[PDB]
A paper describes a structure:
Upon dissociation from the Fo domain, the F1 domain can catalyze the reverse reaction, i.e. hydrolysis of ATP driven by rotation of the central γ subunit inside the cylinder comprising α3β3. The catalytic sites are located at interface between the α and β subunit in each catalytic dimer. Here we describe catalytic intermediates of the F1 domain in FoF1 synthase from Bacillus PS3 sp. during ATP mediated rotation captured using cryo-EM.
The two F1 domain 80° structures were obtained from 56 k particles using an αDβD covering mask. The two 80° structures shared the canonical asymmetric hexamer which adopts the closed αTβT, closed αDβD, and open αEβE conformation. In the αDβD of 81°, the γ-phosphate of ATP interacts with β/Glu190 and β/Arg192 residues, and the adenine ring interacts with the β/Tyr341 in the CT domain. Therefore, ATP bound to the catalytic site of αDβD stabilizes the closed conformation of the β subunit. The overall structures of αTβT and αEβE in the 81° and post-hyd states are mostly identical, but the αDβD structures differ slightly.
Numbering used by the authors:
A (entry chain E): 1 to 470
B (entry chain D): 232 to 471
C (entry chain F): 353 to 471
D (entry chain G): 230 to 284
E (entry chain A): 24 to 501
F (entry chain B): 24 to 377
The structure:
Amino acid sequence: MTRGRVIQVMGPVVDVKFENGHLPAIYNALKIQHKARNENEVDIDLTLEVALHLGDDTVRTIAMASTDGLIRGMEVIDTGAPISVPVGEVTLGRVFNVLGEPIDLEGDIPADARRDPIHRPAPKFEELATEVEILETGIKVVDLLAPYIKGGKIGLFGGAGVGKTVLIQELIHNIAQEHGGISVFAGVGERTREGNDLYHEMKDSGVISKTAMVFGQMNEPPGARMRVALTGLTMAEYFRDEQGQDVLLFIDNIFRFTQAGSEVSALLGRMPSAVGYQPTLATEMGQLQERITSTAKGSITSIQAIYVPADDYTDPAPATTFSHLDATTNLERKLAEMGIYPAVDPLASTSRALAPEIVGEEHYQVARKVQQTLQRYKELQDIIAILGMDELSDEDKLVVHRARRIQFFLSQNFHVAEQFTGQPGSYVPVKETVRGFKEILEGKYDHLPEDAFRLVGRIEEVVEKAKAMG
Amino acid sequence: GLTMAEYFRDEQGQDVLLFIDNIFRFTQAGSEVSALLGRMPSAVGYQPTLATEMGQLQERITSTAKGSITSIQAIYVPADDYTDPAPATTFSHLDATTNLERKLAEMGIYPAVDPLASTSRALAPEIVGEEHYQVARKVQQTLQRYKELQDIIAILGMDELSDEDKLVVHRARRIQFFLSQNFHVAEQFTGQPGSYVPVKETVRGFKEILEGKYDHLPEDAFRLVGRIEEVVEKAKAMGV
Amino acid sequence: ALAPEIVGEEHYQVARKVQQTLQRYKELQDIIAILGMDELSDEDKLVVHRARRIQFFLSQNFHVAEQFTGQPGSYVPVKETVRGFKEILEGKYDHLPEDAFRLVGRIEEVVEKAKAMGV
Amino acid sequence: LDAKASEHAARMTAMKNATDNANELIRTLTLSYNRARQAAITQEITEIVAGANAL
Amino acid sequence: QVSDVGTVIQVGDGIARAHGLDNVMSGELVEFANGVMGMALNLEENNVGIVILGPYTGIKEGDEVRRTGRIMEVPVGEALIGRVVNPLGQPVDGLGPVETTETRPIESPAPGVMDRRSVHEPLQTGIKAIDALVPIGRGQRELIIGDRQTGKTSVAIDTIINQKDQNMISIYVAIGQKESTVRTVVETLRKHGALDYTIVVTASASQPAPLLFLAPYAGVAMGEYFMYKGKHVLVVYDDLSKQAAAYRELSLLLRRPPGREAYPGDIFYLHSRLLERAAKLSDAKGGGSLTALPFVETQAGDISAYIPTNVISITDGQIFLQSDLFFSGVRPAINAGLSVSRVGGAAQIKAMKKVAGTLRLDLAAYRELEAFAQFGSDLDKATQAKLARGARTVEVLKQDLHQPIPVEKQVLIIYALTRGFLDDIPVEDVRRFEKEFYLFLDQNGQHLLEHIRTTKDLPNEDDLNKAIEAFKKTFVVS
Amino acid sequence: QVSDVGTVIQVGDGIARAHGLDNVMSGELVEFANGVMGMALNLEENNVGIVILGPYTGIKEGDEVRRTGRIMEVPVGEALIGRVVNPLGQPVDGLGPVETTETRPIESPAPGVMDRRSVHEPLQTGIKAIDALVPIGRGQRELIIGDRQTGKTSVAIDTIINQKDQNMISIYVAIGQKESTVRTVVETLRKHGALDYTIVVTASASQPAPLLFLAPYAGVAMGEYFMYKGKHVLVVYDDLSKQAAAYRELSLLLRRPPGREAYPGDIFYLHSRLLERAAKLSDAKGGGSLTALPFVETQAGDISAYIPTNVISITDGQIFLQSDLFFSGVRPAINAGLSVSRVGGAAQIKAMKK
Ligand SMILES: Nc1ncnc2c1ncn2[C@@H]1O[C@H](COP(=O)(O)OP(=O)(O)OP(=O)(O)O)[C@@H](O)[C@H]1O
Ligand SMILES: Nc1ncnc2c1ncn2[C@@H]1O[C@H](COP(=O)(O)OP(=O)(O)OP(=O)(O)O)[C@@H](O)[C@H]1O
Ligand SMILES: Nc1ncnc2c1ncn2[C@@H]1O[C@H](COP(=O)(O)OP(=O)(O)OP(=O)(O)O)[C@@H](O)[C@H]1O
Ligand SMILES: [Mg+2]
Ligand SMILES: [Mg+2]
């Protein structure tokens, strides 16, 4: 038996009564499709998700859309499975909602396509990778100071105009070009204007054909805003498990995911946690994050943008989110104004992978020396401001001479930045950037002008630019 | 009391003064019984219908075409927290607002009106006059500048202040002290009798103090004095 | 029991003076926290000088604590405690270093360990 | 001249030390403020829920 | 026996619970026996929770309540222009009926992702600071946030007044205010001539909570009518905090589970629904647009509260107003450091963009490096140049009440400031310089004004310097 | 007949309610229709409160619940050495079933006052800082406390590795950690040869809260099996804060009134039960010992928080790891000012203690 009836509606919460012995399972999807029987009714097309078993053959559900127009006693049908979204090559270049239905006007997916459940357990212990492996992104600053790890989670912090979107697009382009892996963008709590702008930017940059976009808009219910991240992760897991690829996953803002979870808990009536959050905050975060791992046949790496409430890093949501992160990237408006692209902060950014055991002794030493030199230059800034640079000792002037060149060499010309600069882009191997920074530190190019380092790829391009300048 | 005043406002068209001893007690009494009435508590333990009840009470106290009622109400602020829901909701119902802070009371300044937080819809150039508006704005600016200097003064001392800031403090202390007054009903607490100061006289006195005519006078001569004439006469008692 | 008719007049006076100096030091700690001891007046500097030594002399080495630090403990009569604190209040030992007042019993041990260290 | 140079150097060093101490105090006070804010939110929500379910 | 009728069981605090109403929809309108209306929000197993849209003192237990069969909706049309109206669409100023021949539902889907267009048209508010540092575009929703008695209402009124010579329709929604204050606002708008294109929606403090809850949605529907007709609409919400408080009161009276600070779990969803209906439509379905200016009142400058954080997350930008700035002499009181616009520069003309960059850097280099002024009195390092430039910029950004400035004059004065033509005028005379410079412009720079108004670009720099020097040689410094 | 068979009434958020089961006892194991285990928590007059020890999605109201007749127990034995198991003893490494032949209860009384002896045998951790400043004895309970990414796991792993040539059994319990990190820990232990004497109990962040709540007790029971047979055991709880959070979650879902920081009133008893089982037995009891090294994660170095204070009030000392000292290049960032061993020195050898 698969037919129920609506018995109680209170906002986004709907209770449905079923026949004895035929109750739906937890997280199962229920469908309401009603046509106006007369002038006093309205058409309904709504999807529900089972949350609790209240007893007496009643089930409490959360709606994925507006509940306006619902009438008690109207028929509900059970699909017998959780929410299922299409997976495969058909999802590339398309924009979806939380239900897996396309938002764009390119047409609907045929019913014969494969679909996968949104809710599933994390990969087992013996299916995981046995060693830590570094993911080469092709960006000099990232590959040197904050290396990325296959299967790891990276936090992203930045301002309004730092260039987060450009960095995301460049990461997508580089991974698709050099590793053959697709990327998935999950718009958790995405503004509609921002989503439209992002879609047009992706189409202009051309990385749209290598990415699948899922948008959960602000005006959608907390259930949809909760499950958008899960449906994006489900779309990525297909390419991890079947094609064996290395896939990238982007989350618009995980804080909105936690807040949607808290709102759902409040609507369900569960008692609040320490600072008003849901009791299951850690469980939900772990269930989301533990599926983003590296297995024996592939990996998924994820980039989270994180909002810190009241700038307090001790707040429970940032405290729980930070427990799963492996790296951190901070974008600086100072560098953005100075002309440094990518605007990645060389001192604030941190990474667990920057250890000699896994990144290499030479790489570790070069990175530490670069950071030390930049810290010394930062320390000397006030005295350079107050007094002329000549007043500094010869050692301090040499330090500044090295540091300015290093700071300029940290920049890079991006493939997606051709629309802004006319010039092509570069993909720099980690060994190449390590060798270049080592040569710069050894004083090999002290006689070259500082503007030859401004926007290049290999270290040889600095020499070529200097030769062209004359 | 409101309906007793409303009868006079409507039927006879009289001008009515309405004085309310404490309007916060209405809110407190309404909140004392909400739980027994069976309503779930609100943020700070108030009743859910706080704003609705307050508006339904306050909106009857208005002036109409048949008559006018001017009402002066005393509003209690629990624990000196102006962010409390009852004063926060009450703020939107008023045209003119007087704020009393116990920081001025601890220092011996009465009536201890906060010179900045107090607001009024009548303080406009076309309502009160250009000279009055400018002198009031200058007084407010001077006091605002003074408030910032106290934090650094309390640590580094007055000696490290610039010549401009020293003069700012010098005039601001005198202005704040001259803001005091002696009330007729304050005889029980001060011994000395009260006074009545007109608006023109107080504007003139504050203009003189802003111009700096009485920089040489001691600051204690401005305490509960009324006019500046009484300031300069009280100075004679100290030999200045 | 801290009453003049119970513990004695001089006991009560010494206790009250110690509490007063400690209260003054607690008040000054805010200023020393930010800008140090340089801007304190000559009175406040002497108050700090006496208060630090009083606070350190309030420490004692216990018999039970011999298992943690190998030093043996001490038992101090109340008369000796009163005499020592009165002497410290009077300024007899202003020249001794403040680290010589820690974990000792009678006031003679302060002098003994100050002599043991450089003095 | 030597006295003036020494005075200026001493003032510079003292002000640097004072600035560092003030920054550390700001950091500690901010930590305490955040803890107090979290505690206040916890207390208010606990009282709200207790009153709500006491019916 | 019929299922389109019921009897009331409980009455109190503005809500009613009725037995029956088997076929009632969620959010449907219902009519009581005495003639008052209600909205069915809670559909329990055996009873319906109804919020009453009027005086509930006439309703008794056991009386009849009937179905209406339709969702809540309000009249829409050009007849509402110049009228002050309640959220139900009934006039409150007298002056006769409204004579509106069309209606629109309160709850309507927002425009989709593919229905929209990028924001590219400026919304000129007439405020120098807003137009230069936090641009607002047509279709953008910008939050105006600050404490009490800081100037949010003044900013809104100035923005509404400035729309006189532009094809923009304004809607003002007053929530929880005094009817006397609404009357004063309407009188000022009538005096300045804004009622020729303005609609006022009022839900005063004496009205039932559901009316305060529904007022912004009625305003949104009235704006959406013109937007889908192909025009441009500006909608202002004078307080969303009072609407949220009314919704909280209704939810607590209906016995729904409370969340943080007693607010219900869907309080964020409510405001996201409200603010997501402002959009800039693609040319495929007309170029009309709707821009929103929600207001939020903070307590002691706390922007970390529940509703402030929700609205900050939802909106496209924030304008922060500070009380210390207000009392320091900066009457607009806009904190340019914290105020942010996420569509900026796409919402500005070329002439404004060519000076706003320099203005922003000057203001930042003043705001930081401030507190050196007292030690900058002892002239050191020539940083006094930056200090003087920042002081003059701050003096330029000041503005008076109900005196919006044309965008061309704003561009000209900002050019004069940023190019160093004010460096020898003392800060005490900057206001007089600007006031007389506007008259000198409208007397002898009509060519420059027309060039800016037509081409949206700066005139020749040589001609600009000639005009500025000509005025400056006549300006007497005192 | 509903004596040994029940029927589910309510299911949700990992807590179920059953009708019947008249003969079930408090704390008993129950088995659901799909093979998922459960624990009988509350014996109401009409219904039974059951805590689901696994994925509760497959459990629907109206399903059958049957008794197992056994108090909550875990399998123990020497066959468990070198294996990775869940808190219920089910292997997760994929090497096949574990051939244990006996079990022990999860809840068991601690050794009495007269059953104990003073700690006098050194536990050599192989780390100079700890072995010098904060000596650890066999039978001691020492807390390791610090912020995130400070080296607590590295200290624990080094201590476990150092026991290669010493008669010690090591148990590593990871509560709420990442599965990839546990996999790397297991690989490092295998590479250094510690799997010959180590049992690994894991409960990742994606597991339900009851498993995280039960894991430390399963670990301590596995340790007690060897401890009461005359051997010496070392048990490491990789995070007690995760267990405390899981228990707070479970209590809030049971609608018990919260207290300080929304924690329940028995959060102290929760850890006191677990940590009071580690002891040094007397000669009459066999002379065995069990050593515990619980972990606590602080926020911004706040050692005065509720959970850190509770754990400090239970153990025999603490080792504090300082974040800014860790970032300054002193990787074994032992803060000597705030680190103390209350029963150390008596265990330290004579040569070291001078
Ligand atoms: N690598 C780059 N090369 C050149 N210009 C760049 C680069 N990155 C960013 N920019 C410039 O900075 C602007 C802002 O970049 P972008 O649109 O990515 O901002 P964002 O920080 O991602 O935005 P938001 O926070 O609003 O989503 C771009 O429009 C472009 O003009
Ligand atoms: N630019 C300005 N110049 C001079 N006076 C101003 C200016 N802006 C606002 N004011 C005055 O400051 C006060 C602020 O009133 P306004 O209604 O604008 O503030 P508000 O923030 O909406 O306050 P509330 O709704 O809490 O009363 C009024 O007296 C107004 O006349
Ligand atoms: N003695 C050491 N020398 C060098 N590196 C070390 C040392 N101890 C720890 N590390 C490194 O420092 C980091 C600390 O990680 P570790 O897991 O040991 O800490 P933790 O406190 O358990 O952290 P988490 O909260 O992430 O579990 C790791 O990268 C580790 O390799
Ligand atoms: Mg206002
Ligand atoms: Mg660890």
